[PDB]
Structure formats: structure tokens, C-alpha cells
RNA sequence: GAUGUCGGCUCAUCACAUCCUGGGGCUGAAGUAGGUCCCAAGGGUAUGGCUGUUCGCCAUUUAAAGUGGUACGCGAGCUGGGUUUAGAACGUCGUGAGACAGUUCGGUCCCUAUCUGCCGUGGGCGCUGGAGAACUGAGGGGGGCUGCUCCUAGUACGAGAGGACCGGAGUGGACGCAUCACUGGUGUUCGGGUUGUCAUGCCAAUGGCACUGCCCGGUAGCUAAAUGCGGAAGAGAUAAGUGCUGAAAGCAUCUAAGCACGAAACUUGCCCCGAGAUGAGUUCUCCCUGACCCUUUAAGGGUCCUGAAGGAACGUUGAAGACGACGACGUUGAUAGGCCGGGUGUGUAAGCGCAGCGAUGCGUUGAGCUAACCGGUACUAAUGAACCGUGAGGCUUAACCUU
RNA sequence: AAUUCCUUGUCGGGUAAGUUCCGACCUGCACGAAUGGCGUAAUGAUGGCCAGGCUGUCUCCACCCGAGACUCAGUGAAAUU
RNA sequence: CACAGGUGGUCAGGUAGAGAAUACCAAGGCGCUUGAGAGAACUCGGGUGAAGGAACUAGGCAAAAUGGUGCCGUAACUUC
RNA sequence: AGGACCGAACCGACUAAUGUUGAAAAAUUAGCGGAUGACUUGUGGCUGGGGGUGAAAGGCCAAUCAAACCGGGAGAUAGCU
RNA sequence: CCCGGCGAGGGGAGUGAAAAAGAACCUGAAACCGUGUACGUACAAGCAGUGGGAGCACGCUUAGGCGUGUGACUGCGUACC
């Protein structure tokens, strides 16, 4: 993410364990992310019997940071860890369907409303 | 019309009716007493001379004092003068304050001595902190090299490296005023603006088109 | 890193034109003190603007 | 960097800075008068005046609090008996800088430091 | 005696609660998305001092989830819909910093009287 | 008398034969996309791995993955893995000592800058009477990159699928700039906790010390991981080229004469440094009208009286900054400290009462204590002078005063 | 291979990797049975490889504190020439 | 050299701790002589660090991190 | 009991950070190792330069080592700068 | 006889032919750092020298481009072994 190599958490109902940043998207001539950034992930780990398996090269976007995500009111949303939601790289959007923890409301679109099942926050 | 000398005094994250809050610097705009004014027989260009803000006139010199005496007297800290930008003033005072940035919502701002001392290395120049482990010794922050060989025969002009730096300017240019707010005489400019906190500045409006 | 030839005495004197040693650049005549008045500073008997304020 | 902030950072780390100021303020309340270098007399002034403000009344509870603030039997003894009533009526300005001259042997500007209202002197030359 | 820094209090939106550490709150807010009529709430503990200026905020920890989350709500913008202060527990500190990236404890831990 | 090497990194820079957008010709190019192709140095021009390796192999970025140079750039830069690697051993060879443009393992890498450059900054003197003040531009760089999609636009063209540029719009990335409210960091001039021992005769409490003992909060500043933001309408000189009108060559033909048009580059505009620019500067404002003695006299030398406007030391000190210069400014004062209201911190002051075996809680007490900030408050220290500047300051043409 | 001209060997495996590491293969440089070989517990400040604590080495660097530099005072060298 | 270097014998006080680790400390020794100011680059020492966790480098690289005491619980291999 | 151990004191110095015109002719701090032994080490003793001495690097012999230093040969020779 | 510690160092007064013989004393260079005067340096720059030389002090300018010392400025120009 902010550094090359760097393992961070799966944030889908597709995968398990950890996955590894190879590059950032949404620009070049950098080797660091910001906040509300677009990642390039390779899967390091995850179960082969789920939709996510070792060494699929995919696109992904940030859903948590332990630095925390912000833009409109500048007021952060911080979490227990750095985490990133996988895209399909061919059809995009969240490849998984639930998770128990929430999304950042400061960087908020279709890609964060398709990845949870809490009724009192927008679906 | 003119460059209006404010003070850096306050900075605020302000709310808007978009759902966004905008980080800002808040500048006290004062009233304007115009002074002697130079016409276009004088130095060749039509400009307006202004005193915005003042001091206790215990330190004043008579040669500045005659300017204020023949026009609106205000026992000024100094003289600032301006080539036109939107227009001009009444030649003794037009009591201008927040009004100046209501016909333009864009500022250019003038280059001021930036109040960061040296700033310089690792702050506006392309140096880093170089490796410190694997027996790297006496070389931790200095570039190590800057030129090449007898080929150029010397150091290039495009390369630059200085232990220290004196008064340095360069503006942000062309940046939007977010608001001006009447009855408190407040000029809100977005985020960055040349100067430390508690600095003076000159604020000119738009010069570019 | 070193030299190439022995310096001339013109060299030494010009280099010092703006790097030699400086002091308190005189003091004023007195009015009120037991000593002679240090310019715009209090004396050791204290009387500058009034009384023995300094005693050390 | 040092910008839009005032006062003097001295040439001591913190444990050293405390231990010299603990000596100095005990000399300062006891003699009413001290001489030291001008950057150092200004920090000496700003340290001793908040202690005097807590100490301006003769009241027992502010004498117990003042012994909680500094474990010194000499500071808490001069105040609340001789010096209490001396500073009782003021609401700031419990000390003064007198710009004594330059120090001896060097061209470092010096001050004599002196409480706003005095009850004691020592007045041999600075050594 | 307060003539400037006064002008900020003249600008501030009237919505701000007066505060001491360890309130419970429910912060009523928007899903934001620019500006949107879909609302939602968050309740838990305020982990930090709200006094900041024209830019006061509620530093909630929602303490409900299984990893937790900290959310910061801007008091002076229309994102914050209404704010009720509820009862003050005990903290015996001002800011409970160990919760900014970890889940934990309530607005009350013991008692915080004289 | 040798300049100290590879690979990688620091740090770059210059030649354009341009990686790319941009203007333009052709196509065996239908339109579109390409190939072809001139013009053009301005700007942007990515990163991990295994190995001591360049190259290798592999994954990825961006619209994009360039050309060429630098004592095989740069060791009076970095490492020091490797090298004949000096030890050793492997692989090899000799009787051996000992050897390798074969190999592998850790292992020193020096120098305060004389002259020379690069960036920043000051002192001395002339700015023509002085002094202070505003100020113009001879001259030189920075931004100059570049995606996305809506409309433009299903239209020219085609057999059908299909099918463009600019312009208008919001918006991302780098590069450059400034900033500290927001969000993180720190905050040795601030509060509180806490392990241990030593102390205040003792208790309760508190403080010295162990890296500020350790720990967490923290005003104000600064700061990038956060913030705001340039990338410009217009002006001219063009390139290649599209031309007109038209010759060499009765015509034909950007071109040869002539004249319309013709790009981020170029001279600029926008920004920023700039009068020593002897091409010595313009323009505003202010102020000095006493005297005698002597010599080289557009003039200087001495002396009485006498030095204005202003300056400088000096003083506290800065939001200006290595030092200066620059600046606030000295009782006319918010310069710096206290102190108080506040933008604004912390966590419940020592003692005493009460419940309890007590730690501790609870009532006393939403307590007590507090730094830089913003505004106040003179509460506290910046005396009064002397001093550097003098009594109206060139020749000569043009303008004006008789002139 | 502490060895391999070619070769980053051929092939499986971990992986963004994969010269090294683990497993197998041999088109085997010049490996090869006292220059000794296979195999092994424990040990070396020993060599390589792997994943996790943790960490400013770095990504990308900020701020605080002190001693030189720099400030004020004192004394006052040198590589060289 | 007032120099941080090296050097054997005898004697053996406290608290907390596994101990001659280690904080402070009794008796005792003793301030290793620039100083003071500022808070530019930078050089060394010391404090602190978001998100990551070596990704920097031939190489994890000191400092940071690990440590102690009661009790549960404990692998391949083995010369048991 | 033990050329045993985790680990001091006591002694060293594989590696890191520094020093590298140093405080010190490799010491400091820190990872690190021996300590009932082939240790650590005082006192006293003993070998002299192509000669000693080496759990072996031609290592070490006055913080030194393919050969110390000094008096004679000696104005070695220098084909060379 | 003067300054100062009780010091370091010198002067003046007086001695002698001589103290420009003052105790390290013989007369006395050059390197070596500073003073004093003359003249030169604020539009300017390369082996630092020569060629031409404003000027200024001094020389009845020898009145005759000049003499002594210096030198704005500038032609031209690469140390010695």
C-alpha cells in the first residue's frame, strides 16, 4: 500500500488469511498510497476452495486503514487493521457479499454498499 | 483594485451546504486610507498608493508623514502602491475592506518572506535522508556528489545545494477565495497562503485572465 | 582538502576585513550613577532612572 | 523550528534544567536578589511567578499545596509569614528584570533579578 | 478581553453540546455521499475532548462490532442531523487513546466524583 | 608523479536523432485504428524479487515504457559482496614453495576546500544637495506533462459490423509551490499517572534520581503520511505545411517576388529574482538661507557659533532569519514575563470529614494547577544625553526664471 | 556443489518473485571412495534459506533535547607548501 | 599527559531481584577543567514516532524489540 | 567427577553503531563468547634474526615483522632515476 | 621615579666613549608580524612582467614628450630547473 511488499487483510466473503500489494493503481511514478486510494493486489494466501486463490492478480480498493480514511469533512474513520476489498478485474465491484465490520463513510459509493449486510446503514 | 494588507491571525475548517468542510486561513482585512497617489506622468503607469494598518507613530519619519498629511492621514506603518487589478479608489480614502473580493472570487497573492527560516533541504529541494546502516558513515544526508567530470569541467547551474537560505518567496498563484463574511470583516482564503502564523501579508486579487 | 602554494599577506588581511573582532562599541557620558553610565543600561550602584535598585 | 512561540530553551537537558532551577529559586526567594545571564533570568522569572501566585495568601491549604509543588522547606518558610503579605495584593507581576550590563570575561548581556517587593538584600559583587 | 478569537464564536453553528469526558451520546448523521436524505446513527463512547473551535467533533468508538470502529463526526456541518449528550460515566482520564485503533470499554469504568 | 573499480544506491545533468501530446504531408489509408512521416527540447519520463551479475527469468504500473553521453558519469560520494580476492577451501594444476580476465565466505576504504565553480547572504562606496519613502524593467529561470468519460458526433465514409478531431464539462496521477485549520507525528518552558530507592525527625502526602527513569494526555509552533494549488485567456516571430495570386518553364506548381493562415516550443503574457543596468535610474515627500582666516581653487584646508530632515550605537526582542540584512519597538509602549477573558489543556489539588479490617471510593471540590496563542491589562524593565549627518550643494547644451 | 565452459542448468514446488532454498533429473566441466565418501545427536560470535514478534534501515520523513558547526568569549594547530 | 586504555593480592554494608545482572544507596570516593547562547546545514550522542514490517543493502542493521518469578503445557530427531 | 551448560564478576573481541588530521597507534557502547579449565593470571625463570618461538597465518619476536637493531667490511653496487 | 600581585614587561632619571654596549649585552642580514608616511585601489578581472601612461608629492618640469617614487587605465604577452 504505503510500502511495496506489504501484506494486508482480505475484506470479502470470497477469501481467507492475507494478500499482498504488488503496485498502486490510479497513477504511476509513485511507490506509496494515500487515503481513499486504488490498489493492485496479488493474492499471497487464501483457501483454494473459495473464489479467491493463490496468485490470482486482481484489482482492489481500500475499505479500512489503521491510519484511517478521509476526504469530505476531513474527519477520519479508523479501524483495527489495514484492509482492502477485491474487485473482479473484468466486471469489478465487490467479489464477496458479507462482512461483520463496517465501511468508511468518508469514501463511499457502490463498492462499499455491496460488501455488507447491515440494514441501518445504506444498502 | 489594490493589494490589501491583512494579518495572519486565525485558521479554520469551515462548513458548507455540500456535505464538505473546507480547511481555510482567516485574514483580518482592515479599512483603507489612500495616500498621495502617483498619476501616469509619475514613473509612467497609473497606480494607487494605500495605507492599510498602522503603528503608534513614535518611530515615524517626516518624509513618509507628508504623504499621509496631504491625503487621508492615518500615521501609517508604511506605503504600498498598486497597478490596477479590477479598478482604482477615491484619491484620499474609499474605506475598502471585505468588498474588494466580491467582483472576483480569485486571488493571486504577492511573494512574501515565508517565515520558515531555511526550509530548504528536505522541505522544498529534492534531497533525502540517505542510508545510515550497513557501515554508511560520514555520509547520511549530504548528496555525496552534485557534478560529473572534466567533460562539463565544473558544477552545473541547474544543480543547486545550500547549507542555509535567506528570504525566499514564490506564491501558490490563482487560488480561490471560498468566502468573504461581512460584519466581522473576515477574509477566508482556502488552505495554503505565504507566511507563518502572526505574519503580515499583502493580498492582491486576480491579475491573470 | 589541502593547498597548492603558500599564501600571500594580502590574502590574510582581506579575509579579515569582515571577520575580525568586535566589542561593546563605546558607552555614553553619565548623569545619575556612581560609575560612568553604560549606554541605555543600569549601573552596579543602581541609579539610572532612580534609587539603588541594583546593590550587587 | 522555533516560530510563533516565545521564551528561551537554555543549554540543559530536562533533569539538569530542573536541578539548577531548584537551586536557583531557593536562592532567589531567600535573598530577594540574584544575578544571572539575560536568557536565563527570563526563564527564572517565568518559573518563579506561578509559584508566588499559589503562595500569595497566608492560608494553610495553599502552604500545604505549595510543599506538594516543590519539596523545599526554605521556599515555603519565607513565604506565608514574611513574604505572603508582601505579594498578597497583586494579581501578577511578582518579579522584575533589571538589565545590569554585560557579564564579565565575555560579551553575553546579563540581568540582576529582583522580586517586585523586597524584604532582604545580599549585595557584594557577582562571583 | 476577547475581541478576536471572539469572531469564531460568532461563526460557530449553535448545535454544539457543552462537554466533559466520558459521555455516551448518539450521533445522528447522513451517509454523506455529497449530500443525501438517507440517514444512520452511531452510539458508544466519545473517546476524546470535543473542544477544537469552528470544527468541534465527536470522536466516537462504536464498541459494538467484533473488530470495532472509531468514527469522527463534524458538529458544524449539516452531516450531523441532531446530537443528544446523555449521562457522563467515569474515565478517570480525558482521552482513552488505546481505543483509536482497538475495541474496548464503555463510557463508564468506575466512578469519577470528588 | 596513475583521477579509486564492478553491480546497486545517492546525486544528477547535458546532445535531440522526441517515449508521448501538439501543428502538418503520404498511404498498396474507404471511415475508424495503424503503418508512413516532417516540425519541435518545453514538461512529465514508475517498482519488488532471487544473484556479489549488467544481462536473466517473472509480476506489475502508466496513455507511455525513449534515443545518446558523462576518467566503463560521480569513491577530495556511498557500500566493500566480489575481484589474482592476498587467509582458507572448492574446482584446477605442480615435487613443492605457489598460481587463476575460474569460484565461493566474512573483512579497513582516508583528507577541516588554497585557487576554480554551484546556491544564499552581508559589509564599503557612487545613485550628483541631503534624507526617508514609493517604484519601472535592460536581463534570467519556474508552471509548460498527461489519462478518463458526457456532450461534441452515428456525421463524412461503408458492403455490413462499425465510424474522428477540436471545443464545452466535471475529475484523477505526476512535477512545482505554499500551508498547518483538518488528519497523523512531535511538543525536555503544561497536567496527571506509575515501577524502585533515597529524603523531608515520624504519618499522610510530596520531590531528587534511574536516557525527559518510564507512561499517557497537551497549548502554540513546525511537519507530510495531511492540506490547499499552478499547468493561463491573449500578443507576436514562426516551423513543417495548407494556401492565394504567380514566375523561373506563355501553363503548371506553400514560393521564386508578393500577401491571408500555420504548435505545448520560441519572444512573452502569469509567477518569481532584478538599477553597479556607470545605459549610474525615474517619481513622491521632507529639510538645512550664521561668520572669518588661507591655497591647488566647477575645489579643498583650519576655526568660532553650529549640524535640520535623518541616521547609527544602544534596549527588550521577533510571527524575519547561520550571521546579518529584514522586523516589532523603548512608558507615545501589548516588545517579553506575570495575570485575566477566550479560541483552548488536564482529570479530580495538600489537608479535613464519612463508610470500611484497608487500599480506596464518596462529601468538602466539575476541584486544584497551566507554556509559547488571540484580545486585554503597564502589574514589571527598556533614564536623560552625547555622537555620524551642517548653515541652500558642478561644468555645458535643450526647457523655464529678464535669462 | 564453497566445484558446472554453456546455464539466470532440465523439471516439480513455495511465489508478483525464485540465480539461492526444498524435492527430483542428468545433455555429468575437471565430483567420486583417506586431497576420503555416505549418515547422525550435540556444538560454532560459522555459511545459506524460510515464516512470524518487533523495530526510522527504508517506503517518505517530522518534531524535541544536548555537544561541536553556527552565536558570544578564550587559546589556536594541520594534510599541504 | 589531568588518558575513556591496561594490571594481580586482601577485605566484604542496604532495599527490591534468580545472582558479584540490575535502579537507587550506607561509609567512602568523586565532578575525567572550555564555558555560556542559539536551535541554519550537517556531524555524533539521547528521546519519540502514523500506516507497513526490512519491502534499504552483498547482508535485519547495533540502539528499538527479547529478558524475570510461580504455575499449566510442551514437537520432529537422538549418541535417549 | 566433568577440556559440560544459561551466565556474570574477572578476561577476550566474531559482528553492529561511532571513531576513521581519534580520548585511545581498535578503544568506546551494544549484539557476543570462556569462567572449576587446553581457563583466567600475578610472581619468578628461560630461547636472539634466515635465529628463535608458533593448538600453523611465514603467524610473532619492545601496542611492529618472509627476518629487529647497532658497530666494522662500506664511499657494497646502481647497468638507473 | 611611573603602571602591576606579591607578577610579566617596558619607559623615564642617572652612569659610560658607546646602552642604535643594558646584562641572552660583540657589528648585523633574510624569513618572520605590525606600525608610520608617500602615492594607488568603488565599473572591473589571467605567471603579475614589459611597452605607452593620466595623475600626485617632490625636482628653478632641463621651459624642451623630462627626473625620482608610485600608478588609474590600457597595447602585448603562457614560471624556472
UniProtKB/Swiss-Prot annotation, chain B:
Keywords assigned by UniProt, alphabetized: Methylation, Ribonucleoprotein, Ribosomal protein, RNA-binding, rRNA-binding
Keyword Ribonucleoprotein: yes
Tree of life domain: Bacteria
GO biological process: cytoplasmic translation; ribosomal large subunit assembly
MF GO annotations: rRNA binding; structural constituent of ribosome
Any one GO CC term of the record: cytosol
Modified residues (N6-succinyllysine): 38
Post-translational modification remark: Methylated by PrmB.
N5-methylglutamine, modified sites: 150
Statement: the UniProt record of this protein carries the keyword RNA-binding: yes
Pfam family, one: Ribosomal_L3
Subunit record text: Part of the 50S ribosomal subunit. Forms a cluster with proteins L14 and L19. In pull-down experiments interacts with CedA.
UniProt record similarity statement: Belongs to the universal ribosomal protein uL3 family.
Function per UniProt: One of two assembly initiator proteins, it binds directly near the 3'-end of the 23S rRNA, where it nucleates assembly of the 50S subunit.
UniProt-recorded name of the protein: Large ribosomal subunit protein uL3
Organism expressing this protein natively: Escherichia coli (strain K12)
Swiss-Prot record, chain C:
InterPro entries: Ribosomal_bL32 (IPR002677), Ribosomal_bL32_bact (IPR044957), Ribosomal_zn-bd (IPR011332)
Name listed for the protein in its UniProt record: Large ribosomal subunit protein bL32
Entry superkingdom: Bacteria
SUPFAM superfamilies: Zn-binding ribosomal proteins
Molecular function terms from GO: structural constituent of ribosome
Presence of keyword Ribonucleoprotein: yes
Disordered as annotated region, ranges: 1-37
Cellular-component GO terms for this entry: cytoplasm; cytosol; cytosolic large ribosomal subunit
Subunit comment: Part of the 50S ribosomal subunit. Contacts L17.
UniProt keyword terms in alphabetical order: Ribonucleoprotein, Ribosomal protein
Any one Pfam family match given in the protein's UniProt record, by short name: Ribosomal_L32p
Keyword Ribonucleoprotein assigned: yes
Family stated for the protein in its record: Belongs to the bacterial ribosomal protein bL32 family.
Signal peptide positions (record): none
Gene Ontology process terms (BP): cytoplasmic translation; response to radiation; response to reactive oxygen species; ribosomal large subunit assembly
Swiss-Prot record, chain D:
Keyword Ribonucleoprotein belongs to the record: yes
GO biological process, one term: cytoplasmic translation
Record GO terms (molecular function): structural constituent of ribosome
Pfam families: Ribosomal_L17
Transmembrane domains' residue ranges: none
Alphabetical UniProt keywords: Ribonucleoprotein, Ribosomal protein
PROSITE patterns found in the cross-reference section: RIBOSOMAL_L17 (PS01167)
Subunit structure of this chain's protein: Part of the 50S ribosomal subunit. Contacts protein L32.
Protein's name in the database: Large ribosomal subunit protein bL17
Annotated organism of origin: Escherichia coli (strain K12)
UniProtKB/Swiss-Prot annotation, chain E:
Biological role stated in the UniProt entry: This protein is located at the 30S-50S ribosomal subunit interface and may play a role in the structure and function of the aminoacyl-tRNA binding site.
Keyword rRNA-binding: yes
One MF annotation (Gene Ontology) recorded for this entry: large ribosomal subunit rRNA binding
Keywords on record: Ribonucleoprotein, Ribosomal protein, RNA-binding, rRNA-binding
Family to which this protein belongs: Belongs to the bacterial ribosomal protein bL19 family.
Species, as recorded: Escherichia coli (strain K12)
Stretch forming the signal peptide: none
Induction behaviour: Part of the rpsP-rimM-trmD-rplS operon.
Quaternary assembly: Part of the 50S ribosomal subunit. Contacts L14. Forms two bridges to the 30S subunit in the 70S ribosome, contacting the 16S rRNA. In pre-50S ribosomal subunits interacts with RsfS, which may inhibit association with the 30S subunit.
A GO term from the CC aspect: cytoplasm
Gene Ontology terms: biological process: cytoplasmic translation; ribosomal large subunit assembly
Official protein name in the record: Large ribosomal subunit protein bL19
Matches recorded under SUPFAM superfamilies: Translation proteins SH3-like domain
Entry superkingdom: Bacteria
Amino acid at each position: 500500500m504505503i510500502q511495496e511488499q506489504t501484506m494486508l487483510n482480505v475484506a470479502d466473503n470470497s477469501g481467507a488469511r492475507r494478500v499482498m500489494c504488488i503496485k498502486v493503481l490510479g497513477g504511476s511514478h509513485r511507490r506509496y498510497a494515500g487515503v481513499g486510494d486504488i490498489i493492485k493486489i496479488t493474492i499471497k494466501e487464501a483457501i483454494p476452495r473459495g473464489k479467491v486463490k493463490k496468485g490470482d492478480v486482481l484489482k482492489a480498493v481500500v475499505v479500512r486503514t489503521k491510519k484511517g480514511v478521509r476526504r469530505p469533512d476531513g474527519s477520519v474513520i479508523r479501524f483495527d487493521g489495514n484492509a482492502c476489498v477485491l474487485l473482479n478485474n473484468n466486471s469489478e465491484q465487490p467479489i464477496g457479499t458479507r462482512i461483520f465490520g463496517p465501511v468508511t463513510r468518508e469514501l463511499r459509493s457502490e463498492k462499499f454498499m455491496k460488501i455488507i449486510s447491515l440494514a441501518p446503514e445504506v444498502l | 483594485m489594490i493589494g490589501l494588507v491583512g494579518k495572519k491571525v486565525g485558521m479554520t475548517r469551515i462548513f458548507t451546504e455540500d456535505g464538505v468542510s473546507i480547511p481555510v486561513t482567516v485574514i483580518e482585512v482592515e479599512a483603507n486610507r489612500v495616500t498621495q497617489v502617483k498619476d501616469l506622468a509619475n514613473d509612467g503607469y497609473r497606480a494607487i498608493q494605500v495605507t492599510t494598518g498602522a503603528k503608534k507613530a513614535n518611530r515615524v519619519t517626516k518624509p513618509e508623514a507628508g504623504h499621509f498629511a496631504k491625503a487621508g492621514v492615518e500615521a501609517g506603518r508604511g506605503l504600498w502602491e498598486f497597478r490596477l487589478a479590477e479598478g482604482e479608489e477615491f484619491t484620499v480614502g474609499q474605506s475598502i475592506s471585505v468588498e474588494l473580493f466580491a467582483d472576483v472570487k480569485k486571488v493571486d497573492v504577492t511573494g512574501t518572506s515565508k517565515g520558515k527560516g531555511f526550509a530548504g533541504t528536505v522541505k522544498r529541494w529534492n534531497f533525502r535522508t540517505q542510508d545510515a546502516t550497513h557501515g554508511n558513515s560520514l555520509s547520511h544526508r549530504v548528496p555525496g556528489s552534485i557534478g560529473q567530470n572534466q567533460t562539463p569541467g565544473k558544477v552545473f547551474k541547474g544543480k543547486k545545494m545550500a547549507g542555509q537560505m535567506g528570504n525566499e518567496r514564490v506564491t501558490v498563484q490563482s487560488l480561490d477565495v471560498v468566502r468573504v463574511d461581512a460584519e466581522r470583516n473576515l477574509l477566508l482564503v482556502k488552505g495554503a497562503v505565504p507566511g507563518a502564523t502572526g505574519s503580515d501579508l499583502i493580498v492582491k486579487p486576480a491579475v491573470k485572465a | 582538502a589541502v593547498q597548492q602554494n603558500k599564501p600571500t599577506r594580502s590574502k590574510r588581511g582581506m579575509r579579515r576585513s569582515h571577520d575580525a573582532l568586535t566589542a561593546v562599541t563605546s558607552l555614553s557620558v553619565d548623569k545619575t550613577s556612581g560609575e560612568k553610565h553604560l549606554r541605555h543600561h543600569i549601573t552596579a550602584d543602581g541609579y539610572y532612572r532612580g534609587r539603588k535598585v541594583i546593590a550587587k | 523550528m522555533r516560530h510563533r512561540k516565545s521564551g528561551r530553551q537554555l543549554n540543559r537537558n530536562s533533569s539538569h534544567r530542573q536541578a539548577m532551577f531548584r537551586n536557583m529559586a531557593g536562592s532567589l526567594v531567600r535573598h530577594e536578589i540574584i544575578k544571572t545571564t539575560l536568557p536565563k533570568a527570563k526563564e527564572l522569572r517565568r518559573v518563579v511567578e506561578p509559584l508566588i501566585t499559589l503562595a500569595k495568601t497566608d492560608s494553610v491549604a495553599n502552604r500545604r499545596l505549595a510543599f506538594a509543588r516543590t519539596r523545599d522547606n526554605e521556599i515555603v518558610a519565607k513565604l506565608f509569614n514574611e513574604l505572603g503579605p508582601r505579594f498578597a495584593s497583586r494579581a501578577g507581576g511578582y518579579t522584575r528584570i533589571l538589565k545590569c550590563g554585560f557579564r564579565a570575561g565575555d560579551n553575553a548581556p546579563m540581568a540582576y533579578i529582583e522580586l517586585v517587593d523586597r524584604s532582604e538584600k545580599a549585595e557584594a559583587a557577582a562571583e | 478581553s476577547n475581541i478576536i478569537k471572539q469572531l469564531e464564536q460568532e461563526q460557530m453553528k449553535q448545535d454544539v453540546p457543552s462537554f466533559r469526558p466520558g459521555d455516551t451520546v448518539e450521533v445522528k448523521v447522513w451517509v454523506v455521499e455529497g449530500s443525501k436524505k438517507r440517514l444512520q446513527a452511531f452510539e458508544g463512547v466519545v473517546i476524546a475532548i470535543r473542544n477544537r473551535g469552528l470544527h468541534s467533533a465527536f470522536t466516537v468508538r462504536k464498541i459494538s462490532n467484533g473488530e470495532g470502529v472509531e468514527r469522527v463526526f463534524q458538529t458544524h456541518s449539516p452531516v450531523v442531523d441532531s446530537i443528544s449528550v446523555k449521562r457522563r460515566g467515569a474515565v478517570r482520564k480525558a482521552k482513552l487513546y488505546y481505543l483509536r485503533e482497538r475495541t474496548g470499554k464503555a463510557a463508564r469504568i468506575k466512578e469519577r466524583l470528588n
